[PDB]
Short mmCIF file of C-alpha atoms in Angstrom, two decimals:
data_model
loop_
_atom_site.label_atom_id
_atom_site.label_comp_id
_atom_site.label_asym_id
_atom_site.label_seq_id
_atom_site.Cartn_x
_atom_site.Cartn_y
_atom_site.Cartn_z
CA UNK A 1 101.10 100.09 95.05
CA UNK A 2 103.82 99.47 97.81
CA UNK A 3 106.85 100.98 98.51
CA UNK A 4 109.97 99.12 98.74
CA UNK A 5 111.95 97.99 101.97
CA UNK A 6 115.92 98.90 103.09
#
């Protein structure tokens, strides 16, 4: 599982 980017 990955987090996310901003």
């Amino acid at each position: 599982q990955v987090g996310g980017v901003v």
